[PDB]
Amino acid sequence: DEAGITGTWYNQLGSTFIVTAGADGALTGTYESAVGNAESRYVLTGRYDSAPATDGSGTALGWTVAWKNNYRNAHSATTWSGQYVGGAEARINTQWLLTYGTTEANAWESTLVGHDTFTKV
Amino acid sequence: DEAGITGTWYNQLGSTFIVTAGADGALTGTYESAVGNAESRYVLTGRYDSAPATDGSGTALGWTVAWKNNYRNAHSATTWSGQYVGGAEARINTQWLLTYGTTEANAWESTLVGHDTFTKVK
Amino acid sequence: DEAGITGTWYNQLGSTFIVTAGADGALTGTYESAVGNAESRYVLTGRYDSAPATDGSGTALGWTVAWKNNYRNAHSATTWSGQYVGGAEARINTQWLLTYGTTEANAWESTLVGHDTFTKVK
Amino acid sequence: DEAGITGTWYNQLGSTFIVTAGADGALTGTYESAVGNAESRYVLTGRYDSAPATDGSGTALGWTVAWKNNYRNAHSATTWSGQYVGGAEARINTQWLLTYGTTEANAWESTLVGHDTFTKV
Ligand SMILES: [Cl-]
Ligand SMILES: [Cl-]
Ligand SMILES: [Cl-]
Ligand SMILES: [Cl-]
């Protein structure tokens, strides 16, 4: 649980996700994107189910990155929603929503959707 | 900004979203859902753009709730992604993803998607 | 059902959706978008459940528009997925995915998601 | 274009997608799901960009299946939105929305989202 999730993760684009899972269900850490208007690390914070079912199911979790740090601001935020799966091939499988700030007129085009799979590599 | 976002919000389902926005970009608070396998408040945490553009654009933000508290655990988590819009009729417009724990064979059906609009008045 | 769905619909952006529902479950018509890189009508095609439950549940449906017509080509396509709800205030509530052609390096940013609500009155 | 898309496709779950692309941008065919409340083939219909950019970009397309056929009805419909990518490893990369009919009270839980990658295998 806590131990399985804590540590470094990499996704299929080469991005780096460093996270600490608290016994209380907290996720905290940093994210570094291999793509987009991003450089160096960004703060992340999220939550995970700290007492998952014991029927073979994954562990639900989610986190957010606002794409502002000391280097740049891309006026956007991404949330990843998914589940942690344990085993020899531990994975965090996610889908994500990236919203950027828009005028109300352009609200219809404010949100991208995609999917990331993270491995300990 | 920080002052605009902090406080109590309500969505179209009758859910209650209570949040404090930090100067650093943090969001912290609690969420109470009017629907689903949920009761009472749940911890939420997230992030918002603490230095948005000044061109009339909204403020990007997101937050997460894991649906476990001292009363219930629905083995699932929702992330809201959207933007805060100031002015007279302040709103937070979001789309969300709800993932629940599944077996690997059932992963394809693990995630719901929807949209919530939050305002300051009941 | 077939009679309820067939005809002209309007969404919250001012777009116009004209559709014919077939007895077999087919949807055929045209879409005119009030926003984006689009002008005039575009062909749409899709499917709906021609034998829905009779328990008060909505009618599932979906359709696709590729944003090429005789005037413009925006190298993109939108799919709407949702349900038709009958009764006095008939609506089609949808969420949509818009994908545009990208290079492989840019695929991660190829798809927008949103929601449209269609009604019969302007 | 037309030739690249037409034919049989398989996704990562083992589902089978048989499609004919028309010169006019039409997609027609059948879908057979390896999972869910589904058996045998279902009608599909969709659209694709019949004159894509020539800058290396993929070909945008989308299609719908309503999960009713002569065998069963699952009171739901899935739309796939994505792009066709040519080459030695031709792929149709998609994201999808599955909506099932619900009461208005339960509308909030009516729609699933996911992703499918199709190959000619
Ligand atoms: Cl069992
Ligand atoms: Cl104004
Ligand atoms: Cl009623
Ligand atoms: Cl160039």
Whether residue A95 contacts residue B111, with contact meaning beta carbons closer than 8 Å, is answered with yes
Residue among A80, A96, A97, A113 with most chain D CBs within 10 A, to mutate = A113
Number of neighbouring beta carbons within 10 Å of residue A55: 9
Residue among A94, A108, A117 with most chain C CBs within 10 A, to mutate = A108
Q: Quick one: closest CA in D to C47, which residue? A: D66
Distance CA A50, CA D57 (A): 43
Q: How far from C93 is each of C9, C60, D102, CA to CA, in Å?
A: 11, 10, 11
Strand-pairing partners, residue C105, are none
Q: Verify whether the Cβ–Cβ distance B103 to A56 is below 8 Å.
A: yes
Q: With contacts defined as CB-CB under 8 Å, which chain B residues touch D97?
A: 113
Binding residues of B for biotin: 31, 42, 80, 96, 108
CATH superfamily label, A1-121 = Avidin-like (2.40.128.30)
CA of C87 relative to ligand 3 center, distance in Å: 9
Distance CA C114, CA A111 (A): 7
Number of neighbouring beta carbons within 10 Å of residue B74: 21
- Which helix or strand (DSSP H or E) is residue C85 part of? strand C73-85
Give the method used: X-ray
Number of neighbouring beta carbons within 10 Å of residue C68: 24
Name the token pair of B5. 């976002």
> What is the distance, to the nearest Å, from the Cα of residue B75 to the centroid of all Cα atoms in its chain?
17
Name the token pair of B119. 């305002």
Q: How far from D92 is each of A14, B4, C99, CA to CA, in Å?
A: 22, 44, 12
Q: Verify whether the Cβ–Cβ distance C114 to A112 is below 8 Å.
A: no
Q: Phi first, then psi: give them for residue C88, nearest 5 degrees.
A: -55, -40
Number of neighbouring beta carbons within 10 Å of residue C99: 27
Architecture of domain B1-122: Beta Barrel (2.40)
Whether residue C77 contacts residue C99, with contact meaning beta carbons closer than 8 Å, is answered with yes
> What is the distance, to the nearest Å, from the Cα of residue A7 to the centroid of all Cα atoms in its chain?
13
DSSP state of D22: -
Whether residue A75 contacts residue A100, with contact meaning beta carbons closer than 8 Å, is answered with yes
Question: Residue written as tokens 């083992």?
Answer: D14
Q: With contacts defined as CB-CB under 8 Å, which chain D residues touch B36?
A: 108-109
Binding residues of A for biotin: 31, 42, 80, 96, 108
| Nearest bound ligand to the CA of residue D104 | 3
Computed from CA positions of residues C83, C84, C86, C91, in that sequence, does the dihedral angle turn out positive or negative? Answer: positive
Q: Verify whether the Cβ–Cβ distance D48 to C100 is below 8 Å.
A: no
Determine the longest span between alpha carbons in chain C, in angstroms: 48
Q: What is the DSSP string of A46-103?
A: EEE-SS--SSS--EEEEEEEEEE-SS-EEEEEEEEEEEEE-STT-EEEEEEEEEE---
Distance CA A99, CA A50 (A): 28
Name the token pair of A73. 């601001």
SS3 C73: strand
Q: With contacts defined as CB-CB under 8 Å, which chain D residues touch A113?
A: 95, 113
**Non-local CB neighbours of C54 within 8 Å, separated by 6+ positions:** none
Q: Verify whether the Cβ–Cβ distance B114 to D108 is below 8 Å.
A: yes
Residue C80 known to bind ligand: yes
Name the token pair of B93. 């417009």
Q: Verify whether the Cβ–Cβ distance A113 to C113 is below 8 Å.
A: yes
Distance CA C48, CA D65 (A): 8
Name the token pair of A19. 């996270």
Whose CA is closest to A78, among A7, A17, A4?
Answer: A17
- Which helix or strand (DSSP H or E) is residue B5 part of? helix B2-5
SS3 B44: strand
Whose CA is closest to D115, among D98, D100, D99, D101?
Answer: D98
**Non-local CB neighbours of D88 within 8 Å, separated by 6+ positions:** none
Resolution (A): 1.8
Whether residue A116 contacts residue B77, with contact meaning beta carbons closer than 8 Å, is answered with no
| Nearest bound ligand to the CA of residue D105 | 3
Q: Phi first, then psi: give them for residue A87, nearest 5 degrees.
A: 115, 180
CA of C100 relative to ligand 4 center, distance in Å: 18
β-strand pairing of D16-21 with D7-11: antiparallel
